[PDB]
Amino acid sequence: SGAIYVGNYRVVNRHLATHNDWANLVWEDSSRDLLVSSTTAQGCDTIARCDCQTGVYYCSSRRKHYPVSFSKPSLIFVEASEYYPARYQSHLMLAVGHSEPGDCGGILRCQHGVVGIVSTGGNGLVGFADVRDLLWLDE
Ligand SMILES: COc1ccccc1CC(=O)N1CCCC[C@H](C(N)=O)C1
Ligand SMILES: [Zn+2]
Numbered sequence: 001s002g003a004i005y006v007g008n009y010r011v012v013n014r015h016l017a018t019h020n021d022w023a024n025l026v027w028e029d030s031s032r033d034l035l036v037s038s039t040t041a042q043g044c045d046t047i048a049r050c051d052c053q054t055g056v057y058y059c060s061s062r063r064k065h066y067p068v069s070f071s072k073p074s075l076i077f078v079e080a081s082e083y084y085p086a087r088y089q090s091h092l093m094l095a096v097g098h099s100e101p102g103d104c105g106g107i108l109r110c111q112h113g114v115v116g117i118v119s120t121g122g123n124g125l126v127g128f129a130d131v132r133d134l135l136w137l138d139e
Pocket of ligand 2 (some may be wrong): 048049050051052110111112113
């Protein structure tokens, strides 16, 4: 679990969005596993606007942060799950690091701010949904 709170927006994994997120929907994209909802309170986070390929993510299944080198956002095949059919997930960045399904929502940050959130993983892999291209989150 986990979310990004920026301005009057809450960014979550689309597959973990609540009834309240959907009732206050701003934007969602199944191909990216992202959903953004509106909030009444002002958010605590700031978004990176950069091309960093290293950063640190929070891993809830270890209660720890880990450094990572990750690939640029791209279209990657993701196997079927309870939440989605087998499909290509876009704007996804992969890295070597520990993850379990419940780690979705953990934030990946570089020195410039929030880069994205955990969205996929595998045997010693962790994948992050990028949010740096969503320029409208800042206004
Ligand atoms: C962090 O997730 C994992 C980590 C280790 C192993 C497996 C997973 C689970 C995973 O990658 N899934 C299935 C559940 C959620 C939806 C994801 C998606 N974005 O399509 C894909
Ligand atoms: Zn950066």
